[PDB]
Design an enzyme around this catalytic site. Structure first.
Site, PDB file in Angstrom:
ATOM      1  N   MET A 259      -6.367   3.019 -20.157  1.00  0.00           N
ATOM      2  CA  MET A 259      -6.772   4.257 -20.688  1.00  0.00           C
ATOM      3  C   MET A 259      -6.122   5.396 -19.930  1.00  0.00           C
ATOM      4  O   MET A 259      -6.865   5.732 -18.818  1.00  0.00           O
ATOM      5  CB  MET A 259      -8.007   4.293 -21.033  1.00  0.00           C
ATOM      6  N   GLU A 260      -5.665   6.537 -20.362  1.00  0.00           N
ATOM      7  CA  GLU A 260      -4.878   7.558 -19.782  1.00  0.00           C
ATOM      8  C   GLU A 260      -5.695   8.794 -19.421  1.00  0.00           C
ATOM      9  O   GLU A 260      -5.426   9.995 -19.348  1.00  0.00           O
ATOM     10  CB  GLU A 260      -3.537   7.916 -20.300  1.00  0.00           C
ATOM     11  N   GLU A 294       0.293   4.083 -18.500  1.00  0.00           N
ATOM     12  CA  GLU A 294      -0.853   5.209 -18.504  1.00  0.00           C
ATOM     13  C   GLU A 294      -0.310   6.302 -17.834  1.00  0.00           C
ATOM     14  O   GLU A 294      -0.879   7.455 -18.020  1.00  0.00           O
ATOM     15  CB  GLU A 294      -1.987   4.627 -17.709  1.00  0.00           C
ATOM     16  N   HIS A 297       1.651   8.679 -19.928  1.00  0.00           N
ATOM     17  CA  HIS A 297       0.982   9.550 -20.774  1.00  0.00           C
ATOM     18  C   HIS A 297       0.447  10.701 -20.245  1.00  0.00           C
ATOM     19  O   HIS A 297       0.105  11.700 -20.877  1.00  0.00           O
ATOM     20  CB  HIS A 297      -0.422   8.778 -21.109  1.00  0.00           C
TER      21      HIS A 297
HETATM   22 ZN   LIG Z   1      -0.704   4.614 -24.776  1.00  0.00          ZN
END
Ligand SMILES: [Zn+2]
Ligand code: NA
Ligand code: NA
EC number: 3.4.11.2
Length: 866
Positions: A259-260, A294, A297
């Site tokens: 998760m970024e 990530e 992102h």
């Molecule tokens: Zn993504």
């Protein structure tokens, strides 16, 4: 629950510009204080509607005045009579230890961590939880110093204190406005790997990688991969990191992969930890792919975010595209493309035919976590890649630059991005935009003619998209259709028309059209849809000889692979039919010869040879049928493998020995040889049984690394070899204390061809290394069974279906996200025969009746039953 529609998007009545969070952390009871600076843009009679789920509201203040004009509704706090500008103050309680769904603030082992995408921030405090609301965050964290020695949030750490009673606090400030989905918080005890990276312009960035205590020895690859990501983004896109500090935390309990969150990525520990004896080549390359993803992102998602969730692909397709370009730059582009195309045709096409089918930009969403999909991500990426294909690298790069220049610091739409590409490049993409609004897989039919009088080759290309569950109206797309023409000696024939060059990417924009090429001096064998230039099923009546011709002569590696796939596709169908009538495999000799030729071509990249010798998966070949017979397909994959293993036993063992390597290295040339070598081993495991047991037993006991140990253990299971149970037992006994390593073993159990596999899988629910509360263990045991063992899942007695129903009945209450991932195989019911349809339908009907049916399941079950 109830649907939201993209066409209903309106700008919000209120904005928040700054929020100051305080967390008095404790697993049982966390108190959150949230001071937000807000502004009304709408009408004065329009209240402020704050989302919130499972919060205990303690107090509400407006410019410091305890507020009396508010109420609580279905999942919102509604506040009236507000001035034009004010400070909102909310105090609420949440309980992380109760949070089994892993949405919001929960507990992963001893640590506390967050997940906010898509709408998890509202499980932490009352907010405007939607990504077109961007604010500057400041996050103070107070906690027990022994239990939570590290207290992390986005941005820079700007204050620090001790308190009486062994508690301490830290405060973080992130200068860049973000939507709440990008908020994160971590508290716990960690070993920390620290390094630095200096940007292209001289900015020095501290890198900090937090893992559970003991695991500092599985961290350095992830750290290296982060650095490679940062360098590559600079080199290829001209993009540098924008903060002083890049944190990454690896936790064990996590629903996504990673998760970024801005400057504080949170990762499933699966996509961080690697050691040569615990992780495969495929692991290493995955960790690389996901860390990069990530990281990329940071620009495509954070510095420019999404106006609303229907725009998810604006960031996912483009960030997948970016991770694919990164992997392909640093490794094999052809192997990368091949694997990504296997994913599109195997898994994605199935979704685009399912009850769950949607455009990359959905028009309707009930639960948004159901739209983190193969379609939004992988098809998304193919759509980006078509843009790239139409514009070329220089123009595509100019579009990226205009996209940032226009939308840096804000939330944007798919259309905004498509427009930046249009304006910067001068290529018209009005028709192209239809790729965003239309679901389903186009089918491109190709008919050809050679005319020796005129030396003209004529392609009649036509396209249709069949109706999907979600849309009745389909239309022609702007399809970039790349070709190459080969003459009789294997050389490319130049594409001309009226003796002027012509571009090799054809703009297939109508339902039907005709292209004519001049100076085709010999009847061509064509490569069509070159490198999968558009995500379409291709229909063209190949002769086997055209296909073998391309396998030997085509200049593009990917076409060689792809021709081989088309060649096998004919014989997979033939043999599924033969299987249905009780006949043995039929397979012509020229087919076998073609694959022998590849194996002993000494100028072919071993990685290519390895993919060519990797048979389509059961999912990939299920796409070839209208009605799937999963038992036949399984049984046919097995037979086709035996046959080649018999037909090519000598060459296979030669190549197997030739690519032996005494050194283990995670380096692209070495990974290729090990991949080819283990493909050869896979076949030999389906050959003469004693030699098999010997080779496979020896390789297992004598590696070196997990890539070679698992390749052997895996053949032992696939081919049901005598040594199997012993190898499986060694592995358990050595590796049980370690989930990420055990995941591989569960997958093998769950995908076993053996007879009582379900009975086994059930019992493994009690195995020491299994736990229903860890999404990784669930995906490896239950998910692998349902998703990747369709011969057992789809047993004629309906036993696989009921097993899933049991598991889902549990997970609907425990972790709806994971449950929704698990249900996907059951909503494919319409591709199966009638008897299987009825039973699957029955199982969905049972789950439809659960008390507290989650929205996540609900959305899929109603569409499947419609
Ligand atoms: Zn993504
Ligand atoms: Na704002
Ligand atoms: Na490369």
């Amino acid at each position: 629950p109830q649907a939201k529609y993209r066409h209903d998007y309106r700008a919000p009545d209120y904005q928040i510009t700054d929020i100051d969070l305080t967390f008095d952390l404790d697993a049982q009871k966390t108190v959150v204080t949230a001071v937000s600076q807000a502004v009304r843009h709408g009408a004065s009679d329009a209240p402020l509607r704050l989302n919130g789920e499972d919060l205990k509201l303690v107090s509400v203040h407006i410019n410091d005045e305890p507020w009396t004009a508010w109420k609580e509704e279905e999942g919102a706090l509604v506040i009236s009579n507000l001035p034009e500008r004010f400070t909102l103050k909310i105090i609420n309680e949440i309980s992380p230890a109760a949070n089994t769904a892993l949405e919001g603030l929960y507990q992963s082992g001893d640590a506390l961590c967050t997940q906010c995408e898509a709408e998890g921030f509202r499980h932490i405090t009352y907010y405007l939880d939607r990504p077109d609301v961007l604010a500057r965050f400041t996050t103070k964290i107070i906690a027990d110093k022994i239990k939570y020695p590290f207290l992390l949030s986005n941005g820079n750490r700007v204050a620090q204190g001790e308190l009486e009673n062994g508690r301490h606090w830290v405060q973080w400030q992130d200068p860049f406005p973000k939507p709440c989905y990008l908020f994160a918080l971590v508290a716990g005890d960690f070993d920390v790997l620290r390094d630095t990276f200096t940007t292209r312009s001289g900015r020095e960035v501290a890198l900090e990688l937090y893992v559970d205590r003991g695991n500092l020895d599985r961290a350095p690859w992830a750290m290296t991969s982060l650095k490679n990501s940062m360098k590559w983004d600079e080199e290829r896109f001209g993009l540098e990191y924008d903060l002083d500090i890049y944190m990454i935390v690896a936790v064990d309990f996590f629903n996504m992969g990673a998760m970024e969150n801005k400057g504080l990525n949170i990762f499933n520990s699966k996509y961080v930890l690697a050691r040569t004896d615990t992780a495969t080549d495929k692991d290493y390359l995955d960790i690389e792919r996901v860390i990069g993803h990530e990281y990329f992102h940071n620009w495509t998602g954070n510095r420019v975010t999404c106006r609303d969730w229907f725009q998810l692909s604006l960031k996912e397709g483009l960030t997948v595209f970016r991770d694919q370009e990164f992997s392909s730059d640093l490794g094999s582009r052809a192997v990368n493309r091949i694997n990504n195309v296997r994913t599109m045709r195997g898994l994605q096409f199935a979704e685009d035919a399912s009850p769950m089918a949607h455009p990359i930009r959905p028009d309707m969403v009930i639960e948004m976590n159901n739209f983190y999909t193969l379609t939004v991500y992988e098809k998304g990426a193919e759509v980006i890649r078509m843009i790239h294909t139409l514009l070329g690298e220089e123009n595509f790069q100019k579009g990226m630059q205009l996209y940032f220049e226009r939308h840096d610091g804000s939330a944007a739409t798919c259309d905004d991005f498509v427009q930046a590409m249009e304006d910067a490049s001068n290529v018209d993409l009005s028709h192209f935009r239809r790729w965003y609004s239309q679901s389903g897989t186009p089918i491109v039919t190709v008919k050809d003619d050679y005319n020796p009088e005129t030396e003209q080759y004529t392609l009649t290309i036509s396209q249709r998209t069949p109706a999907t569950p979600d849309q009745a109206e389909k239309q022609p797309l702007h399809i970039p259709f790349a070709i190459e023409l080969y003459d009789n000696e294997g050389k490319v024939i130049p594409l001309q028309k009226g003796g002027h060059p012509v571009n090799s990417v054809l703009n297939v924009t109508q339902a039907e059209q005709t292209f004519v090429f001049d100076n085709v001096y010999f009847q061509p064998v064509p490569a069509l849809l070159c490198e999968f230039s558009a995500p379409v099923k291709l229909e063209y009546k190949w002769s086997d000889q055209q296909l073998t011709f391309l396998m030997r002569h085509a200049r593009n590696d990917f076409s060689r692979w792809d021709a081989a796939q088309s060649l096998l596709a004919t014989y997979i169908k033939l043999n599924v039919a033969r299987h249905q009538q009780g006949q043995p495999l039929s397979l012509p000799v020229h087919v076998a010869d073609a694959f022998r030729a590849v194996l002993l071509d000494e100028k072919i990249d071993p990685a290519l040879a390895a993919e060519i010798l990797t048979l389509p998966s059961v999912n990939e070949m299920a796409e070839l049928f209208d009605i799937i017979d999963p038992i036949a397909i399984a049984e046919v994959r097995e037979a086709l493998t035996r046959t080649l293993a018999t037909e090519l036993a000598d060459e296979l063992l030669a190549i197997y020995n030739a690519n032996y390597q005494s050194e283990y290295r995670v380096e692209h040339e070495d990974i290729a040889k090990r991949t080819l070598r283990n493909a050869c081993l896979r076949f030999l495991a389906f050959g003469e049984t004693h030699l098999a047991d010997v080779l496979v037993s020896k390789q297992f006991h004598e590696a070196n690394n997990m890539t070679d140990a698992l390749a052997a253990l895996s053949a032992a299971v696939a081919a049901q070899l005598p040594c199997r149970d012993a190898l499986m037992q060694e592995y358990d006994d050595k590796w049980h204390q370690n989930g990420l390593v055990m995941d591989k073993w569960f997958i093998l159990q769950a995908t076993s061809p053996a007879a009582n596999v379900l009975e086994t899988v059930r019992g493994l629910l009690q195995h020491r290394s299994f736990t229903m509360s860890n999404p990784n263990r669930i995906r490896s045991l239950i998910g692998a069974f349902a998703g990747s063992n369709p011969a057992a899942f789809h047993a004629e007695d309906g036993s696989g279906y009921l097993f899933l129903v049991e598991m889902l009945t549990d997970l609907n209450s425990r972790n709806p996200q994971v449950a929704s991932r698990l249900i996907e195989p059951l909503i494919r019911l319409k591709r199966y025969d009638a008897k299987r349809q009825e039973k699957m339908r029955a199982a969905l009907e049972q789950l439809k009746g659960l008390e507290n049916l989650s929205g996540d399941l609900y959305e899929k079950i109603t569409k499947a039953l419609a």
